[PDB]
Structure 1
Amino acid sequence: PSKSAALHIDLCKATSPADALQYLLQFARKPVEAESVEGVVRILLEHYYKENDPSVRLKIASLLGLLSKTAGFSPDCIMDDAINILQNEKSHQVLAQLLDTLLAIGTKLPENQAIQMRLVDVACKHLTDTSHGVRNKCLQLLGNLGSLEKVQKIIGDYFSDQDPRVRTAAIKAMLQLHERGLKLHQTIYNQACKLLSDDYEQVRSAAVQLIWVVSQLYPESIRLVDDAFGKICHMVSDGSWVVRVQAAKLLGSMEQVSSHFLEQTLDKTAHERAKELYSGAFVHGLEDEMYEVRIAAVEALCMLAQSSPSFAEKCLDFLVDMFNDEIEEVRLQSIHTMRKISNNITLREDQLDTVLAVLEDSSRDIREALHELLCCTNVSTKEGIHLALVELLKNLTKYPTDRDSIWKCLKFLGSRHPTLVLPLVPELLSTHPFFDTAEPDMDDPAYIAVLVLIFNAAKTCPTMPALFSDHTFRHYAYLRDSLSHLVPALRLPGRKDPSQQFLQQSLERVYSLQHLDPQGAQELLEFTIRDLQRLGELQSELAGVADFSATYLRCQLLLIKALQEKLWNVAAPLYLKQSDLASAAAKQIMEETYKMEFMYSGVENKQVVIIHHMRLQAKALQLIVTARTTRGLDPLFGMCEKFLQEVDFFQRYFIADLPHLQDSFVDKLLDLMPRLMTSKPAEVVKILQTMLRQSAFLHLPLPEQIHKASATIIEPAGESDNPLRFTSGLVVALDVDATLEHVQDPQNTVKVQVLYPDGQAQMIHPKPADFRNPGPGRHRLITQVYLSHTAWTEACQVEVRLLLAYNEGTIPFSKPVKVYIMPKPARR
């Protein structure tokens, strides 16, 4: 249809550069066939392909390639394309588009032999071009068409062909061959030895990858991996900067290498001069042009240092010296690599230098990283521990904000090697031999810092509570009571699912007790609702299901209370409102249905159908009350028709689970539906009334572990009496910071609502980038909210709240906060 119309239109237009171009652009721009008519469209296009101006043919081939993604075409398109290529040799562009289409067809679906990947490959090979027509594209075509696990000859010759672009094409095809294995031969090593020196960019960039990949397969040349590593080394000083990144990364990834040759990278020193005082590829790679290559170098070094247990000691100085790099990223990477290689390493004299860095301006990341390093380093000399302790104390007294990490690093520094600290016990805590030392303050975060070290060390060495002074015992009790994740239990003489079952029991009791007076029903529901709320507050893991069932039972109670209203005992014309609480009952119940459907996280189809049935129930109640109050036959009929349409929509949509909905309101209503359609609304309303009166209570199935969404606005606090001031008409930005717990798709739902004093509410959608995800199902929202308004005489209150939207309407799920705003009028 559409394809035939397009073909007819193109044939009629027959405009050389106009009609063909416009038709192709429209066809590609609008949409794909999305049907088997792709074959017919392709046949029609091939019919018109016999023309001039090969630009139109190229566009048609591009359209064919795009259509090939639909997976509908298979062998018919392959045969047609082969036939077309067999005789469409005209210029380079046409062959280019044809080769692209053939590649698309080959890798689109077939992925098979038997003229699915072999015939096309042979045809492309035979169609080798003379001047850059397809050469690169046919190379990548045979690259993605892996013959078998037996082709390399042709590429062997092509390596030394004319154009560097074609060389890169061959290299990428080789990469594609390797990534499927294919057990590449050894001769490629010797062939690429010259490729290393190709004296053009974009060639060596991947020749290095080829030499690495072939080398890592097997180290047997005369030394093969060592030779390749030497080649990479001699290349690391490439003229460009793009090459060196791959150079570093690949040698880093390599893992096995001759030890003796490995140190020859680092061999050149002032470092050995310092060592005596106390008693080349990387050498240049570490200090290079821009920080990218430094990052790559440190990563390679950490990788191969991990690999080789030796060679680490040789690299500690080369790491530590490179701390004051001035690039924070290199700083952090150096700290991280030192941590990652920290094992069986000694800092006999490096301690002071690596600790001097601990005093940074704020560099919160750097200082925290240094603490992380210390907690995993190793020292051997007692004076080293003493030194680290004193610099840590200086750190704490100058930056009294990360004591919470100082303590943990000290804890680990103790546990790692306890015996080292035992000689320090008398000295570090003042224990004047024959004087009773005055109790040092219990809460001082230097005394606590030095006590946590001792206590953590004390798990191992049994003798030392003898060294412990008088206070240390009660102080240990106080610590072990306060910070239970820093001091372990010791040997000191001084300190020598009923909930879930009950929930189910209560729910099933409510289910069972339905054959009794509504008066008793109301009280039973009230008792159990306050019960469930109490249990939800008591527990935390059941806080979701408890509150969910609580809201459900509350919904049912509201329906029952509405039904037992005094309104039904007075005639229709005497309705006088001020007693028909059902009016607000309907809105409350509907809102509760929305709340339960959306806010909670884990919801199943069974629960959803329960909720939708209850929403239909609320709709029926609203209809009945409205009809009670209104006598107009036309409005009555309109509302009745809407309600019947709603019922039909429900039953169609949830065709399933209707048998499970036994003896339900909806069940009996649907069973009796046709006569309701026939009857006049005036009696339909009475039928619905009695129907609800005699309706039953559904049994809600309890789900697996769930949670209820919850937002907490932390900033702005809102209790600050100082108003935010700004000139009239302009804007002030309010930082909004919130924590959202157990929400699905926060970025497409949560919205910040600002209620100005004058009664106007502005909705603000935060950006998809405002939502950080520190942990499982616990997102952070950080954003700016823009406030503005004309001049106010005095400060006012602007309310900020977090809303949840659904697919129509919104639900508040957060505590509104107040912000003081003061727009003054313009100055001079």
Structure 2
Amino acid sequence: SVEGVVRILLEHYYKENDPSVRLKIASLLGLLSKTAGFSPDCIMDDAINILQNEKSHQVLAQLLDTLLAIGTKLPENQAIQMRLVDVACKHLTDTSHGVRNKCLQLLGNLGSLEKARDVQKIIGDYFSDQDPRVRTAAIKAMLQLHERGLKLHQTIYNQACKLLSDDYEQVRSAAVQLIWVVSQLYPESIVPIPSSNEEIRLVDDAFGKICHMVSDGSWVVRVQAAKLLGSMEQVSSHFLEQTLDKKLMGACGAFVHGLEDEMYEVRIAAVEALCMLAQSSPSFAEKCLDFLVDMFNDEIEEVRLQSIHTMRKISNNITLREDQLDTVLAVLEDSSRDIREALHELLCCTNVSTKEGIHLALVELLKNLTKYPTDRDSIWKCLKFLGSRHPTLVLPLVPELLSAEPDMDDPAYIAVLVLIFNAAKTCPTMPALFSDHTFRHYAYLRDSLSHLVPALRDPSQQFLQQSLERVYAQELLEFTIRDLQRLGELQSELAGVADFSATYLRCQLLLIKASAAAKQIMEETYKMEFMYSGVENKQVVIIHHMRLQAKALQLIEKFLQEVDFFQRYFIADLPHLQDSFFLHLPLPEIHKASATIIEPAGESDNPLRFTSGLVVALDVDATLEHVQDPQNTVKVQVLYPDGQAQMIHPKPADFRNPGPGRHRLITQVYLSHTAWTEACQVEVRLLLAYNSEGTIPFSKPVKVYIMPKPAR
């Protein structure tokens, strides 16, 4: 009953004279226009008849809004689009600004993508209109037209550049965006500077113009330009290096003016631009390294963190010096643990050039260990990379670092041990300097912490291949399972597929031997699905087949609906699941995610005090490694000894991001209950939440001791 009531309301609009009620009716039409499967194209002519005799302003605005909404609904009927363009150019000259906004948006979203009026020039005439909002909407329509796929003309740059000296805010940002895109269109063209006789590539003109634009008195446009400079690669390098000559103080020296501007936001945007343009060009990277290491002494922490990430992203494209290494390692003394973790991950890939540099790096990392103990698990891993990259610099440190025999519980001793073992793995001559007690220590850290110490002086890959082809019964399954476990603890680089195939064969064994074993099958399939990274459609087929087996076997109604769902979602795998309910599992290329609860340790006999009925705060600080988007699939679980369970979902902004594959989770958990009599223990652990609805425990739980003291 759409067209009927629409025609009734149109006959009302014809007889009703109050413009506000007319606008009410028009809004009703606009809201009803979105009926999916209805033909309001029969009403487009009527809409044009309404706009052909209007006297108000907003009416035409929202009416052309409806026309644009319906034109975006059928963008293939080019005749309707040409009619809309016609009536728009008819109405384009209207005096009001809102109607002009609507017509320019209609042109932008419904322009002719074929190279028959030149809508480009018609719109471009409006960069000289009176109300600057009209010019803003005009540039926005230009952007919309371009982004649909139309390649634009050269002149737009030469017309937009005039707006650079305008005294309004959004217009300048839009102008910078237009220059950016049009120079990404015609970069190499030759434009002569009218202030001289020189002629430079158009990309260089664009770059210099954006640089000078950064010197504007508005900060929004400064953010815009600083960001948009980020992806400008094809510009000539000498101009770029000129943009950091602090001595020349606007087409040059922009970065210096930015990295010390008032609002830290433009500083951060400039850091991003520097990072990108340094990843593209290594010479400019080494040139800007000075200001980049200078950015460490910025008073606020977010620029610190971001500059740290960026500088680490250009490791091979820079070379650190003595003073640079000193200034970067002096930062470890900072209080914010996030900066510390970021700095740790930074140090894993730095290009150190001097042996005393490695000495001082180890010295400062050990100092950081002493000051902040909890950072332990970080430092070691970073050292795992330190020795595995620069063996020629650590070579003379072996006699001095090996120095009485310290005990096996000094984190510094173990750290330097891992470092020198990573060194010796890359040059087998250091094992001869390793003392007998050093060899005992190496054996201890080897059978204990093989995930840090390497295997000193690939057959394991072909060994895994033969072990997987041997299984293609229970005794061979057990033997292969323990072989996979032993090799996974032997080589951590391959431990991923090791535990993958281990739990797969575990499921196979528990299924072939077979009430709770079905639940165990289900949980192992759950873990292989969710807790792991890098699964392909083949593995999904296999694990869903195992799930079907598990449900069919736990049966001894819903089974038929679920196998129907399986068939519907797996229409492609059916020619690949021949003779199914053994099914081959390919081992793809893999890392097992995990969780390391660190703060607090709970081993402290000093408990946490609380009063006779009140909250108490518990700060959880735990790192995660190679987790797939932890913002969703991670929760913290609290168990009181009674039997209840609190499942605290953590907020988004509490999962910090220090580096690739590593994430940090610092959060607050609120411990209390009904009145407590005596000091007791509580359980806090992690959980992986999945929706196929379920929870998987994958961290070693931490028991915290809470002690009462009734209030005063």
Shift of 1:249: 0.7
**CA 1:599 to 1:475, structure 2 compared with 1: closer, same or farther past 3 Å?**
closer
Shift of 1:355: 3.7
2:215/2:250 contact within 8 Å kept = no
Which residue, 54, 59, 80 being the options, matches 1:89? 54
Q: In the aligned structure 2, how far is the partner of 1:183 from the partner of 1:617?
A: 56
Shift of 1:207: 0.2
- 2:478 maps to 526
Shift of 1:146: 2.3
1:755/1:762 contact within 8 Å kept = yes
Shift of 1:768: 9.7
The one-character-per-residue Cα deviations of 1:354-400 (angstroms, maximum 9, x if unpaired) are 34424324322222222222221112223322332333333333333
**CA 1:170 to 1:408, structure 2 compared with 1: closer, same or farther past 3 Å?**
same
**CA 1:561 to 1:114, structure 2 compared with 1: closer, same or farther past 3 Å?**
closer
**CA 1:96 to 1:618, structure 2 compared with 1: closer, same or farther past 3 Å?**
closer
Q: In the aligned structure 1, how far is the partner of 2:664 from the partner of 2:303?
A: 28
1:824 equivalent in alignment to 2:709: yes
The one-character-per-residue Cα deviations of 1:789-828 (angstroms, maximum 9, x if unpaired) are 88788779999999999999999999999999999887x7
2:187/2:202 contact within 8 Å kept = yes
Shift of 1:331: 0.5
1:770/1:782 contact within 8 Å kept = yes
2:342/2:659 contact within 8 Å kept = no
2:81/2:110 contact within 8 Å kept = no
Q: Cα RMSD between the aligned structures?
A: 8.0
2:637/2:648 contact within 8 Å kept = yes
**CA 1:728 to 1:158, structure 2 compared with 1: closer, same or farther past 3 Å?**
same
- 2:381 maps to 408
2:686/2:699 contact within 8 Å kept = yes
Which residue, 577, 588, 591 being the options, matches 1:703? 588
Q: In the aligned structure 1, how far is the partner of 2:376 from the partner of 2:441?
A: 19
**CA 1:202 to 1:787, structure 2 compared with 1: closer, same or farther past 3 Å?**
closer
Shift of 1:99: 1.7
Shift of 1:169: 0.6
1:118/1:147 contact within 8 Å kept = no
Q: Which ranges of structure 2 fall in alignment gaps of 5 or more residues?
A: 189-198
Shift of 1:202: 1.2
1:415/1:457 contact within 8 Å kept = yes
Shift of 1:405: 2.8
Say which SS state the counterpart of residue 790 (structure 1) adopts. coil
**CA 1:77 to 1:50, structure 2 compared with 1: closer, same or farther past 3 Å?**
farther
- 1:656 maps to 572
The one-character-per-residue Cα deviations of 1:11-67 (angstroms, maximum 9, x if unpaired) are xxxxxxxxxxxxxxxxxxxxxxxxx63664465345444311111121222222222
Shift of 1:219: 2.2
Which residue, 651, 660, 677 being the options, matches 1:793? 677
Q: In the aligned structure 1, how far is the partner of 2:326 from the partner of 2:235?
A: 31
Point out the more displaced range, 790-799 or 470-479: 790-799
**CA 1:749 to 1:165, structure 2 compared with 1: closer, same or farther past 3 Å?**
closer
**CA 1:300 to 1:785, structure 2 compared with 1: closer, same or farther past 3 Å?**
closer
1:619 equivalent in alignment to 2:551: yes
Q: In the aligned structure 2, how far is the partner of 1:71 from the partner of 1:285?
A: 50
Q: In the aligned structure 2, how far is the partner of 1:171 from the partner of 1:65?
A: 26
**CA 1:444 to 1:373, structure 2 compared with 1: closer, same or farther past 3 Å?**
same
1:88/1:95 contact within 8 Å kept = no
The one-character-per-residue Cα deviations of 1:731-771 (angstroms, maximum 9, x if unpaired) are 66788999999999999999999999999999999989999
Q: In the aligned structure 2, how far is the partner of 1:733 from the partner of 1:383?
A: 45
- 1:569 maps to none
1:709/1:742 contact within 8 Å kept = yes
Point out the more displaced range, 795-804 or 258-267: 795-804
Of the two structures, which has the highest relative contact order with CA contacts closer than 8 Å and spacing of 6 or more?
2
1:79 equivalent in alignment to 2:49: no
The one-character-per-residue Cα deviations of 1:236-277 (angstroms, maximum 9, x if unpaired) are 111011110111111111111112211110112xxxxxx999
**CA 1:47 to 1:509, structure 2 compared with 1: closer, same or farther past 3 Å?**
farther
Shift of 1:647: 21
**CA 1:755 to 1:343, structure 2 compared with 1: closer, same or farther past 3 Å?**
closer
Say which SS state the counterpart of residue 169 (structure 2) adopts. coil
**CA 1:747 to 1:56, structure 2 compared with 1: closer, same or farther past 3 Å?**
farther
**CA 1:825 to 1:69, structure 2 compared with 1: closer, same or farther past 3 Å?**
same
Q: In the aligned structure 2, how far is the partner of 1:82 from the partner of 1:189?
A: 37
Say which SS state the counterpart of residue 739 (structure 1) adopts. strand
Q: In the aligned structure 2, how far is the partner of 1:621 from the partner of 1:646?
A: 14
Q: In the aligned structure 2, how far is the partner of 1:249 from the partner of 1:613?
A: 49
The one-character-per-residue Cα deviations of 1:669-728 (angstroms, maximum 9, x if unpaired) are xxxxxxxxxxxxxxxxxxxxxxxxxxxx99999999x99999999999999999987666
**CA 1:664 to 1:376, structure 2 compared with 1: closer, same or farther past 3 Å?**
closer
1:299/1:337 contact within 8 Å kept = yes
Say which SS state the counterpart of residue 116 (structure 1) adopts. helix
**CA 1:166 to 1:352, structure 2 compared with 1: closer, same or farther past 3 Å?**
same
The one-character-per-residue Cα deviations of 1:503-522 (angstroms, maximum 9, x if unpaired) are 999999999xxxxxxxxx99
Q: In the aligned structure 1, how far is the partner of 2:476 from the partner of 2:389?
A: 61
The one-character-per-residue Cα deviations of 1:486-536 (angstroms, maximum 9, x if unpaired) are 333233xxxxx999999999999999xxxxxxxxx9999999999999999
**CA 1:50 to 1:819, structure 2 compared with 1: closer, same or farther past 3 Å?**
farther
Point out the more displaced range, 91-100 or 597-606: 597-606
Q: In the aligned structure 1, how far is the partner of 2:155 from the partner of 2:440?
A: 76
1:285/1:294 contact within 8 Å kept = yes
Say which SS state the counterpart of residue 555 (structure 1) adopts. helix
**CA 1:262 to 1:761, structure 2 compared with 1: closer, same or farther past 3 Å?**
closer
Q: In the aligned structure 2, how far is the partner of 1:402 from the partner of 1:203?
A: 49
Shift of 1:123: 3.7
Residues 16-415 of structure 1: pairs in structure 2 closer than 5 A: 37=2, 40-41=5-6, 43-45=8-10, 47-116=12-81, 118-150=83-115, 151-220=119-188, 223-268=201-246, 280-415=253-388
**CA 1:770 to 1:327, structure 2 compared with 1: closer, same or farther past 3 Å?**
closer
2:345/2:382 contact within 8 Å kept = yes
Q: In the aligned structure 2, how far is the partner of 1:658 from the partner of 1:380?
A: 58
Say which SS state the counterpart of residue 425 (structure 2) adopts. coil
Q: In the aligned structure 1, how far is the partner of 2:670 from the partner of 2:278?
A: 52
2:304/2:339 contact within 8 Å kept = yes
1:248/1:300 contact within 8 Å kept = yes
Say which SS state the counterpart of residue 668 (structure 2) adopts. strand
1:128/1:138 contact within 8 Å kept = no
**CA 1:169 to 1:357, structure 2 compared with 1: closer, same or farther past 3 Å?**
same
**CA 1:246 to 1:528, structure 2 compared with 1: closer, same or farther past 3 Å?**
closer
2:113/2:149 contact within 8 Å kept = no
Q: In the aligned structure 2, how far is the partner of 1:199 from the partner of 1:320?
A: 36
Q: Which ranges of structure 1 fall in alignment gaps of 5 or more residues?
A: 1-35, 269-274, 431-437, 492-496, 512-520, 563-582, 625-640, 666-696
Q: In the aligned structure 2, how far is the partner of 1:652 from the partner of 1:371?
A: 48
1:62/1:101 contact within 8 Å kept = no
The one-character-per-residue Cα deviations of 1:149-178 (angstroms, maximum 9, x if unpaired) are 211111121111111000001000000011
Q: In the aligned structure 2, how far is the partner of 1:425 from the partner of 1:498?
A: 30
Say which SS state the counterpart of residue 322 (structure 1) adopts. helix
1:803/1:810 contact within 8 Å kept = yes
Q: In the aligned structure 1, how far is the partner of 2:54 from the partner of 2:31?
A: 22
**CA 1:396 to 1:728, structure 2 compared with 1: closer, same or farther past 3 Å?**
closer
Shift of 1:314: 0.9
- 2:194 maps to none
Identity of aligned residues (%): 99
Point out the more displaced range, 498-507 or 708-717: 498-507
2:634/2:686 contact within 8 Å kept = yes
Point out the more displaced range, 335-344 or 377-386: 377-386
**CA 1:37 to 1:740, structure 2 compared with 1: closer, same or farther past 3 Å?**
farther
**CA 1:320 to 1:130, structure 2 compared with 1: closer, same or farther past 3 Å?**
same
Point out the more displaced range, 460-469 or 387-396: 460-469
Q: In the aligned structure 2, how far is the partner of 1:325 from the partner of 1:385?
A: 26
Q: In the aligned structure 2, how far is the partner of 1:289 from the partner of 1:198?
A: 22
Point out the more displaced range, 457-466 or 795-804: 795-804
Q: In the aligned structure 2, how far is the partner of 1:134 from the partner of 1:427?
A: 80
Say which SS state the counterpart of residue 71 (structure 1) adopts. coil
Point out the more displaced range, 801-810 or 106-115: 801-810
2:176/2:210 contact within 8 Å kept = yes
The one-character-per-residue Cα deviations of 1:82-127 (angstroms, maximum 9, x if unpaired) are 3333434212121112121112121134453111454355445444
Shift of 1:232: 0.6
**CA 1:510 to 1:250, structure 2 compared with 1: closer, same or farther past 3 Å?**
closer
